[PDB]
Amino acid sequence: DWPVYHRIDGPIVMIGFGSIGRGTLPLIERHFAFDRSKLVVIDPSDEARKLAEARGVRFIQQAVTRDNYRELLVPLLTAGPGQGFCVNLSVDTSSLDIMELARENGALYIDTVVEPWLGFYFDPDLKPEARSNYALRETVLAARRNKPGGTTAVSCCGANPGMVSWFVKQALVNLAADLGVTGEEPTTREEWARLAMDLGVKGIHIAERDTQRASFPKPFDVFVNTWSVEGFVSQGLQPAELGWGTFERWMPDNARGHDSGCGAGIYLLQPGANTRVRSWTPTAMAQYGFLVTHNESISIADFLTVRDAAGQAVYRPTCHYAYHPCNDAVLSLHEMFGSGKRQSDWRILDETEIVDGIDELGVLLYGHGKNAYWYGSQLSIEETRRIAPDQNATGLQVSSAVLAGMVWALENPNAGIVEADDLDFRRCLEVQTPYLGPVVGVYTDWTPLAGRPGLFPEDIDTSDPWQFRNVLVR
Amino acid sequence: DWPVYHRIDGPIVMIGFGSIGRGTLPLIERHFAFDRSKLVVIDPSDEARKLAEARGVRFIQQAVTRDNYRELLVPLLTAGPGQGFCVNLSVDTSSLDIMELARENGALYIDTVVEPWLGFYFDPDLKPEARSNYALRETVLAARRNKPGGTTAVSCCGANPGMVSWFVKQALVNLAADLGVTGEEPTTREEWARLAMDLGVKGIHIAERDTQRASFPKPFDVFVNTWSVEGFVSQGLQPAELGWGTFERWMPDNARGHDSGCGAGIYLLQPGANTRVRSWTPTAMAQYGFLVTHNESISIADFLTVRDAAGQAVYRPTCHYAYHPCNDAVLSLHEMFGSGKRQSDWRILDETEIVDGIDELGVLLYGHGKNAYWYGSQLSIEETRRIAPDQNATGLQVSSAVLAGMVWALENPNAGIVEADDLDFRRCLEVQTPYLGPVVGVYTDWTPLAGRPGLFPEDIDTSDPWQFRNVLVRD
Ligand SMILES: NC(=O)c1ccc[n+]([C@@H]2O[C@H](COP(=O)([O-])OP(=O)(O)OC[C@H]3O[C@@H](n4cnc5c(N)ncnc54)[C@H](O)[C@@H]3O)[C@@H](O)[C@H]2O)c1
Ligand SMILES: NC(=O)c1ccc[n+]([C@@H]2O[C@H](COP(=O)([O-])OP(=O)(O)OC[C@H]3O[C@@H](n4cnc5c(N)ncnc54)[C@H](O)[C@@H]3O)[C@@H](O)[C@H]2O)c1
Ligand SMILES: N=C(N)NCCCCN
Ligand SMILES: N=C(N)NCCCCN
Numbered sequence: 008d009w010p011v012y013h014r015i016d017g018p019i020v021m022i023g024f025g026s027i028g029r030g031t032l033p034l035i036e037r038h039f040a041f042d043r044s045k046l047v048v049i050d051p052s053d054e055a056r057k058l059a060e061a062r063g064v065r066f067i068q069q070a071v072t073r074d075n076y077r078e079l080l081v082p083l084l085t086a087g088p089g090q091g092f093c094v095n096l097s098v099d100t101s102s103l104d105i106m107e108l109a110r111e112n113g114a115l116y117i118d119t120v121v122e123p124w125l126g127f128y129f130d131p132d133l134k135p136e137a138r139s140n141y142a143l144r145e146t147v148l149a150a151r152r153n154k155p156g157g158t159t160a161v162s163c164c165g166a167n168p169g170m171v172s173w174f175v176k177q178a179l180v181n182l183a184a185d186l187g188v189t190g191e192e193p194t195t196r197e198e199w200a201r202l203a204m205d206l207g208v209k210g211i212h213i214a215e216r217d218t219q220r221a222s223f224p225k226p227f228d229v230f231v232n233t234w235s236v237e238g239f240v241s242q243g244l245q246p247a248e249l250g251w252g253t254f255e256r257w258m259p260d261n262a263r264g265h266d267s268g269c270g271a272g273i274y275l276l277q278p279g280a281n282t283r284v285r286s287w288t289p290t291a292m293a294q295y296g297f298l299v300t301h302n303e304s305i306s307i308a309d310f311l312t313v314r315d316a317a318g319q320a321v322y323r324p325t326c327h328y329a330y331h332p333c334n335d336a337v338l339s340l341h342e343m344f345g346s347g348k349r350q351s352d353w354r355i356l357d358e359t360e361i362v363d364g365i366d367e368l369g370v371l372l373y374g375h376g377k378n379a380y381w382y383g384s385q386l387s388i389e390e391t392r393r394i395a396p397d398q399n400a401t402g403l404q405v406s407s408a409v410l411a412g413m414v415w416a417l418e419n420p421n422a423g424i425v426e427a428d429d430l431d432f433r434r435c436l437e438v439q440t441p442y443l444g445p446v447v448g449v450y451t452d453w454t455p456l457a458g459r460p461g462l463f464p465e466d467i468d469t470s471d472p473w474q475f476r477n478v479l480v481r
Numbered sequence: 482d483w484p485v486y487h488r489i490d491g492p493i494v495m496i497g498f499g500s501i502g503r504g505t506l507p508l509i510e511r512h513f514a515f516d517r518s519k520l521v522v523i524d525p526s527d528e529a530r531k532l533a534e535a536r537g538v539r540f541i542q543q544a545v546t547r548d549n550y551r552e553l554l555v556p557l558l559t560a561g562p563g564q565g566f567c568v569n570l571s572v573d574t575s576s577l578d579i580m581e582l583a584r585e586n587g588a589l590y591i592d593t594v595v596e597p598w599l600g601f602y603f604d605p606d607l608k609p610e611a612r613s614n615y616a617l618r619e620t621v622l623a624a625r626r627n628k629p630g631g632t633t634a635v636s637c638c639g640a641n642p643g644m645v646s647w648f649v650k651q652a653l654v655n656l657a658a659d660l661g662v663t664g665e666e667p668t669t670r671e672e673w674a675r676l677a678m679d680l681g682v683k684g685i686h687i688a689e690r691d692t693q694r695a696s697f698p699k700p701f702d703v704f705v706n707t708w709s710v711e712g713f714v715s716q717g718l719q720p721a722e723l724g725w726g727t728f729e730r731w732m733p734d735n736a737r738g739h740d741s742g743c744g745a746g747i748y749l750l751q752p753g754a755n756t757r758v759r760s761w762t763p764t765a766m767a768q769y770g771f772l773v774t775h776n777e778s779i780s781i782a783d784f785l786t787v788r789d790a791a792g793q794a795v796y797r798p799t800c801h802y803a804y805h806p807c808n809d810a811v812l813s814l815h816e817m818f819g820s821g822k823r824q825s826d827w828r829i830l831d832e833t834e835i836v837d838g839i840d841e842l843g844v845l846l847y848g849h850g851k852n853a854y855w856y857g858s859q860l861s862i863e864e865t866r867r868i869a870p871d872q873n874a875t876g877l878q879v880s881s882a883v884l885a886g887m888v889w890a891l892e893n894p895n896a897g898i899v900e901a902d903d904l905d906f907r908r909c910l911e912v913q914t915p916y917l918g919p920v921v922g923v924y925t926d927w928t929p930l931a932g933r934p935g936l937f938p939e940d941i942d943t944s945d946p947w948q949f950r951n952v953l954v955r956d
Binding site for chain 2: 220225244261276278337341344457459464
């Protein structure tokens with residue numbers, strides 16, 4: 008039967024019961040030992056409440072806010088007898104403030120995004136840079152500098168951000184092995200960064216193609232997605248953002264850097280979900296992705312930075328999302344940006360509605376001797392239904408990553424604030440892999456200059472096909 | 482019963498029997514008197530042959546080419562008795578050369594595009610300007626100057642180009658009434674141009690939203706459309722192109738003009754089907770369209786040009802396509818441009834496959850005192866099936882326009898080379914309207930600056946909402 012990894016000796020407080028919470032609950036019940044009454048779900052939605060009642064779990068129908076979060080969460084997380092676990096799978100709540108609360112009270116914490124309190128993503132008084140994921144991530148890095156060590160809190164441990172950091176490590180090890188490079192694999196951050204440098208990895212796309220589709224066609228004036236519509240639209244309206252490689256020799260006129268922080272990012276003064284990049288996955292082959300901002304774009308580039316003695320970066324890979332969502336989501340974006348406003352309604356595709364498809368999600372390492380290598384999951388909806396309830400393929404990649412991060416945090420409970428890049432990738436993938444379907448590594452000779460230039464003048468760099476100059480659709 | 486407008490006494494030579502030929506043949510049989518044996522269909526495909534054989538129509542399985550077109554077509558066009566009609570609904574053939582051949586042999590001619598001989602659209606040695614529809618159209622204008630008058634040949638008389646020119650005239654008449662502009666209805670080009678100027682029409686979108694969809698979802702690595710995939714892709718890869726208004730204050734850095742010709746156009750050094758514009762239709766409300774080059778973008782702007790005594794244009798509207806095709810075609814474009822190459826396969830959706838939807842096709846006149854006015858057809862697939870066989874709603878708007886053009890040509894057979902802008906719009910719409918479903922005019926307060934600027938700095942002109950600077954989507 009299914010492995011039971013650990014006993015949780017305290018309350019399990021799940022904040023949010025949308026597509027991810029719904030997928031994560033059965034894995035928590037499956038894989039951890041605890042008295043049933045220890046677990047409670049918090050979400051303001053009526054739809055969520057009804058589902059939770061049907062699953063027999065405690066449910067508190069309340070929005071967690073800046074005004075109530077201490078009065079609500081401190082008692083729930085300290086109910087006893089021992090260490091609890093805050094599993095934060097929400098929108099509209101501050102990941103930073105909830106994480107700090109959990110740590111102050113000795114509760115473990117995990118989330119899948121650095122989310123702000125409601126009001127931030129569309130605050131008109133905020134400059135674009137202040138709305139960036141780089142800025143949000145810097146709040147977490149500052150919190151870690153202020154309070155090193157202490158109770159483990161795992162930031163951004165879903166599928167992407169999350170699992171894809173483990174895929175980057177596995178891909179680096181595979182690339183070295185395929186080149187005939189043997190020996191002890193890296194154990195420190197500096198060793199990982201040097202491995203990427205040494206192998207000549209110029210950059211990395213988080214290269215995703217979701218082919219799930221429903222039994223009904225996309226409705227007019229309805230945004231359709233396979234996971235959070237609210238969350239996808241919010242990140243899609245944030246600036247396009249990327250980890251910025253030392254090899255890059257060009258950026259657009261509307262690109263900007265940061266005066267402070269880890270140093271690894273740029274952003275563009277335009278929305279990421281209306282920015283296209285040329286990319287590739289095994290099933291899609293050459294495709295457009297959307298350059299939607301994501302925590303891992305910054306965290307992976309930061310993690311893989313090599314500095315000189317003076318502290319200047321001498322190597323860092325480019326890293327960004329290149330997302331091709333499901334076809335109905337592609338149409339939803341065309342509709343939303345074309346109208347200039349959010350649709351009147353939205354819906355997240357349920358497994359009962361999906362006729363076929365996969366969520367092909369991996370990392371595309373490029374610029375090395377073998378040109379490009381994609382490593383990741385090809386999980387299908389059919390396999391998903393066989394192995395986990397209450398979710399589609401997109402959901403299961405995320406919920407299984409939360410499971411893996413929870414196992415890691417319980418196993419390493421005194422590690423302080425950590426990102427997915429800081430965890431034991433082998434252990435996390437050992438836990439996650441039963442839920443990932445085919446996990447494969449594929450080389451390709453494709454580059455962003457394939458077939459170019461065409462019949463119009465193009466500003467390309469033929470000396471270096473993987474330059475962002477050639478990737479960005481301009 | 483259906484009106485039989487005229488007898489056709491000579492050969493009816495249909496070149497091409499794809500989606501539009503299949504929709505047009507039944508209308509020709511319905512609306513003209515003639516012995517069926519006088520019809521001949523020419524198409525290289527086996528698919529077309531079997532369909533033509535099923536209709537008991539004479540078929541020649543040949544590609545018309547620069548090498549064979551004279552030897553092949555002249556005996557067909559001149560078989561008699563009396564005047565033939567060449568109905569050209571093909572791809573890969575020279576509209577100009579075939580039209581000139583028809584005229585020199587006294588046969589009427591109609592087409593729906595200025596198509597070049599196979600090889601042109603992807604010729605790597607062609608300068609971008611030479612790939613433009615402005616350039617192709619100038620070959621037709623030059624032919625007209627060289628041989629004025631004579632046998633009628635109707636260039637670009639489908640739905641768009643074609644019908645939409647008639648919608649522009651009707652829309653101008655309606656705007657004049659609604660804005661209180663008095664005067665007799667224009668009866669000359671110069672008078673139409675002056676009316677557009679007096680009404681303050683800054684520009685015109687050919688504003689289209691196709692909502693047809695099939696019983697199956699879009700297959701991977703298949704381009705899906707409701708009409709010619711080959712044709713749509715070819716025009717989509719031509720430069721983005723537009724008739725250029727005198728009111729415009731800005732053009733992109735990669736815009737270019739023309740040193741010669743009618744003077745009405747610019748083009749952009751990028752493909753039109755990967756160029757977006759902000760536009761609007763009644764059912765879509767605000768939407769993106771693709772800035773795909775079309776003959777009418779140039780022909781309507783040219784027709785509505787006012788010149789001073791020196792010959793300099795003092796007024797001309799902007800005019801261009803703002804096309805939102807069916808959802809499966811939107812996905813097909815994302816796939817094609819994302820991969821950098823044509824899909825391995827394609828299909829045109831048949832009426833038997835389409836579950837619901839309309840082809841909402843009209844003209845959006847903007848900049849006047851009531852902001853913007855859309856006039857056009859909202860034909861549904863359900864209505865299409867009730868009234869005409871072998872086609873979807875896209876096809877029927879086109880085939881019925883060809884029908885209207887044929888009736889006009891038979892009634893005016895010595896008018897020389899003409900575009901849809903030159904035809905009697907009322908007579909043409911009288912013939913076509915039974916096939917157009919709801920034809921409506923709708924005002925809107927929407928403008929391209931609605932909701933802007935938003936969260937990011939935008940390069941907009943806040944002084945004039947309808948400036949191209951505000952319409953063009955700038956990656
Ligand atoms: N790292 C990844 O791979 C990844 C993947 C998917 C989702 N996510 C993120 O996970 C989160 C959940 O995604 P989802 O698909 O479940 O979204 P969802 O939109 O389906 O559900 C969000 C849920 O949060 C709720 N909620 C709203 N306000 C709340 C509040 N004040 N307090 C508590 N709950 C509140 C909704 O009622 C709701 O049910 C999103 O933030 C998201 O961006 C991360
Ligand atoms: N003005 C408008 O509104 C409008 C609308 C639709 C189509 N069109 C145009 O009409 C034409 C036909 O469109 P469609 O949807 O029927 O296209 P289609 O792709 O369905 O059919 C084209 C047909 O031409 C044929 N053909 C190819 N090479 C030929 C040759 N050398 N000689 C003769 N025939 C040849 C194919 O075998 C074929 O059946 C296209 O050029 C097009 O762009 C205009
Ligand atoms: N992952 C990084 N960018 N730095 C390492 C952080 C180490 C936290 N203990
Ligand atoms: N329609 C124009 N642009 N000019 C008028 C041409 C008239 C041809 N008889």
